[PDB]
Amino acid sequence: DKVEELLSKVYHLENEVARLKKLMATKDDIANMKQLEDKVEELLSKVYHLENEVARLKKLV
Amino acid sequence: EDKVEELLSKVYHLENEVARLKKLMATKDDIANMKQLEDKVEELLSKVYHLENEVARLKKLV
Amino acid sequence: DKVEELLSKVYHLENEVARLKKLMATKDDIANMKQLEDKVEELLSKVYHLENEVARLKKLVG
């Protein structure tokens, strides 16, 4: 009776843990976001320089 | 006796699997983090459009 | 006795797994990250192009 209740609950948990393991691999690594943040950091910088260079040209012309 | 031994062993492996999941979870990106990066990509693309239009006029004027 | 112990550990696992599930729903998927990567691919191409144009505008004007 009580051992049965446990058997059923352990079975359910095993399935849940399996689904979580599956879902875990669909989630993105923090290392992927940091590397992307870096690239966006580079694009922040280059765009800043472009805005400066453009202003310069916009005044000469 | 037998079923209880089996249940001890299943619960032990689930505990170790669940413990592994909690450390895996910690190496994964939060959505709110991703949303702030999208906000910066939303900024940069607007600035790149604006610069494209400015450079279009400059090469025309020169 | 050993039934109590297993009843106790199961309960704790149920709560742990419920916590992991709602915590899983805060994490962003590789798909949306790949979409953001695509947009960063574009913007990096457009920046390089703009760099070329401006470098020419600079050396053409003065």
Numbering used by the authors:
A (entry chain C): 6 to 66
B (entry chain B): 5 to 66
C (entry chain A): 6 to 67
Tell me what the authors wrote about this structure, in their words.
α-Helical coiled coils are ubiquitous protein domains, found in a wide range of structural and functional contexts. The structure of coiled coils is understood at a level unrivaled by any other fold. They consist of at least two α-helices, wound into superhelical bundles and held together by a mostly hydrophobic core. β-Layers are found, also repetitively, in natural coiled coils, where they form regular fibers with alternating α- and β-structure, a protein fold that has not been described so far.
The other, MATKDDIAN, is from a second family of prokaryotic coiled-coil proteins that we found to contain nonads and related periodicities; it occurs for example in 14 consecutive repeats in the protein Tcar0761 of Thermosinus carboxydivorans. For T9, two structures were solved in alternative conformations. In A9 and in one of the T9 structures, T99, the β-layers are formed as in Actinobacillus OMP100. The middle three residues, KAD in A9, KDD in T99, form the β-layer in place of position d. We therefore thought that the central aspartate of the T9 insert might have been sufficiently unfavorable (T99) that an alternative, with the alanine of MAT at the center of the β-layer (T96), became observable, even though T99 allows the flanking coiled-coil segments to remain unperturbed and T96 requires their distortion.
